[PDB]
Amino acid sequence: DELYRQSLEIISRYLREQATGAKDRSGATSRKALETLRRVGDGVQRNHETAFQGMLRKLDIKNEDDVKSLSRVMIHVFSDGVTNWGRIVTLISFGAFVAKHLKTINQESCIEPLAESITDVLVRTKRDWLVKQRGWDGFVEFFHV
Ligand SMILES: O=C(O)c1ccc2c(c1)N(CC1CCC1)C[C@H](c1ccc(Cl)cc1Cl)CO2
């Protein structure tokens, strides 16, 4: 699955850099995908901060067996709705928000697994749409400014 490896690399690096605050095959897209993500994902976290605040709170993340359980509550929400790049970035954006919180409570070791949960669901349930959109090229294309 190349579409998956690439999605995991992107979402993973975004999540890791967002939490750490420090930067870390299908090259000439991934770099633009990550670039677009930083821009719009940051916007989404900013303009939607109080809703993110409240959700993180509703979630109550205290430890490792809180992230695992997460997938339940997460598939529930990304899966209810229409497919568009706007709901995908909010999916990944909140993921970034959770990652920020994890490094706060010493559970940075659960960031990569978190990025996996997110990636598994994004490409497991909308893989065909992604293929249709030409993957991350569609993403970058959609958000040009
Ligand atoms: O309604 C939408 O357009 C919408 C689209 C996607 C989306 C969400 C809302 N949610 C809910 C909102 C309120 C706080 C963000 C977060 C959720 C989610 C993403 C990542 C993790 Cl790590 C856990 C969860 Cl639970 C699933 O991703």
Swiss-Prot record:
Residues of the full protein shown: 172 to 321 of 350
Species: Homo sapiens (Human)
Effect on the protein upon substituting residue 58 to R: No effect on ubiquitination
Post-translational modification: Cleaved by CASP3 during apoptosis. Treatment with taxol or okadaic acid induces phosphorylation on additional sites.
Function: Involved in the regulation of apoptosis versus cell survival, and in the maintenance of viability but not of proliferation. Mediates its effects by interactions with a number of other regulators of apoptosis. Isoform 1 inhibits apoptosis. Isoform 2 promotes apoptosis.
Glycyl lysine isopeptide (Lys-Gly) (interchain with G-Cter in ubiquitin) cross-link, renumbered residues: 23
Extent of motif BH1: 76-96
Motif BH2 per UniProt: ranges: 128-143
Subunit composition and interactions: Interacts with HIF3A (via C-terminus domain). Interacts with BAD, BOK, BIK and BMF. Interacts with PMAIP1. Interacts with BBC3. Isoform 1 interacts with BAX, BAK1 and TPT1. Heterodimer of isoform 1 and isoform 2. Homodimers of isoform 1 or isoform 2 are not detected. Isoform 2 does not interact with pro-apoptotic BCL2-related proteins. Interacts with RTL10/BOP. Interacts with BCL2L11; may sequester BCL2L11 to prevent its pro-apoptotic activity. Interacts with GIMAP5 and HSPA8/HSC70; the interaction between HSPA8 and MCL1 is impaired in the absence of GIMAP5.
Position of sequence motif BH3: 33-47
Designated name of the protein: Induced myeloid leukemia cell differentiation protein Mcl-1
Location relative to the cell: Membrane; Cytoplasm; Mitochondrion; Nucleus, Nucleoplasm
